[PDB]
């Protein structure tokens, strides 16, 4: 014979059971990735905003401290504040590199706030909560669903010759 | 034993992607440092000539550029810190060891893609490589 003993119905039944479950996980995973994308966009914009704002404040204060010197406890208090700003500024800049591989210029160019920063920060919290409420996410299910579904479709729509 | 092979293959794929990620991240950092330093050099020169043109006193446009010049310096310093702290590298070390294979913007897209592919592997057990090599 030129035919096959194994019926395609068997593999189809084995796969059909797998389609819908993977579809659910994949739909959850895509939703997660969408919220993650939104979160990242807002966080990059906030980071660039905070860097420019904080550097501006630190620059100004550092100039006033140095201007006053050239002219004791009060002075020390300002220097402590300068130190705190410097640590925070360094952290923000290094965060930009480590988390996004973006320069400040690159971040600002592509992502700027479209609301006041506090509104953006609240938005960040709300997106994080939404992500958290998705529970356990299986990212691999997106690719796994694609493979299983395409295979199932291939065999289904051509079962007559399989 | 087969559930091990799966686990071990995942672990090795994880290691390979992390190497891939590191190379593009450091290559970009070295590239960005040199580009930023060039922009800083260009702007600093431009600031100087403005003070020579005269009448720039109290100019808010000149002040904006001076603040920008300062922010560039702080960013450069922090990029150098990042190389030291994260990879124990100097700028020249990073540049010489890690060269971009593509244009910078495509590399930036690649960074996010590799990170996602890594995250897609889920929880990785590196020790599965060991107990797999043990079954043989």
Author numbering:
A (entry chain A): 184 to 254, 921 to 1011
B (entry chain B): 202 to 257, 919 to 998
Give the authors' words.
Multi-subunit SMC complexes control chromosome superstructure and promote chromosome disjunction, conceivably by actively translocating along DNA double helices. SMC subunits comprise an ABC ATPase “head” and a “hinge” dimerization domain connected by a 49 nm coiled-coil “arm. The heads undergo ATP-dependent engagement and disengagement to drive SMC action on the chromosome. Here, we elucidate the architecture of prokaryotic Smc dimers by high-throughput cysteine cross-linking and crystallography.
The top and bottom helices αC1 and αC4, respectively, form coiled-coil contacts with the top and bottom segment of αN1 in the BsSmcCC1 structure. Helix αC2 lies perpendicular to αN1 to connect helix αC1 with αC3, which is located on the opposite side of αN1. Helix αC3 makes a coiled-coil-like interaction with the middle part of αN1. A short loop joins αC3 to αC4 across αN1. Crystal packing does not involve the formation of a “rod-like” dimer of BsSmcCC1. To establish how two BsSmcCC1 monomers might be arranged within the Smc dimer, we mapped cysteine cross-linking efficiencies onto the structure of BsSmcCC1.
